[PDB]
């Protein structure tokens, strides 16, 4: 879910990037 | 020979687009007529009252219109007669090669 930061969905929510949502 | 015109009022911005193009059309020849670029709107949204009445606002904006002007063949009979031009107060001219 959007609250799960360790996912490509939660990173979109916080507007941030990481291993779980790279660019 | 390129001129770009900025100004808050578009009526002064637009009137000064003919009063420039038609000058370089008096000292010919080739001119590229007044093209308008997209406007840049700076929006301000303010609580209407001085205190606590949060769900009532009033909108404001500052419109910075933009026009482009190109003179193809210089011919210094304008490089003198454009320096001798009478453009209104609220407008910025900026001239590029």
């Amino acid at each position: 879910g959007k609250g799960d930061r360790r996912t490509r969905r939660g990173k979109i929510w916080r507007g941030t990037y990481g291993k779980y949502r790279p660019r | 020979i390129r001129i770009k015109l900025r100004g808050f009022d578009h009526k002064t911005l637009d009137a000064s687009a003919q009063k420039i193009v038609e000058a370089a059309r008096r000292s010919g020849a080739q001119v590229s007529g007044p093209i308008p670029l997209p406007t840049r709107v700076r929006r301000f949204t303010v609580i209407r009252g001085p205190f606590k009445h949060k769900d009532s606002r009033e909108h404001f904006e500052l419109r910075t219109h933009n026009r482009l002007v190109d003179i193809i063949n210089p011919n210094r009979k304008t490089i003198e007669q454009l320096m001798t031009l009478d453009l209104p107060t609220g407008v910025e001219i900026e001239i590029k090669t």
Binding site: - | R6, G7, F8, T64, T89, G90, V91, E92
Partner: protein
Amino acid sequence: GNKIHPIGFRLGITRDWESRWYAGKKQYRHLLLEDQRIRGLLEKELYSAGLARVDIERAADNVAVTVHVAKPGVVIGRGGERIRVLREELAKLTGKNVALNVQEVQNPNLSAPLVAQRVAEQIERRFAVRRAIKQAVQRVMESGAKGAKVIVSGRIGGAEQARTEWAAQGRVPLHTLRANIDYGFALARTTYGVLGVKAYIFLGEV
């Protein structure tokens, strides 16, 4: 309290700005603060001259303050000495080549900002507030205005229970955009508090 400022409402349709110039984001505020510092000085000094509107134009390190006024001879003074007593004190806070101009107002009783200052001074001089309004609305109508409306809010006659009083003649369409309604507010300070004076002058539709 609900009604919108008749000038801000008509800005672009019937009222031009009192300051006209362009300035990219990097120095709008600086020219704006300067604009305010000027108006502060002139509204103080040129109060007894009958100040009605300060126009401030600006282009390239120079500024053209244009003062519309009831008694221009007061502003200029002796042959242009009191005029230049300001033309330089202005430029002492302007730094720029601060050109000053003086304009004659065709009718003072047709200038809403002055009517309000007149009535505001009449209460400071303890005149009858009810009478002092009906008198002013009378002069504006005799001067050809298509309608006028004047309003006093506060401790009229020093009454503990503050109050609002007004009078209006002709017509004052505040909802019409093509109506030219001059508007002017003045503040009247007395010993028992402060009083608000609002003036609406319907000049005509265009």
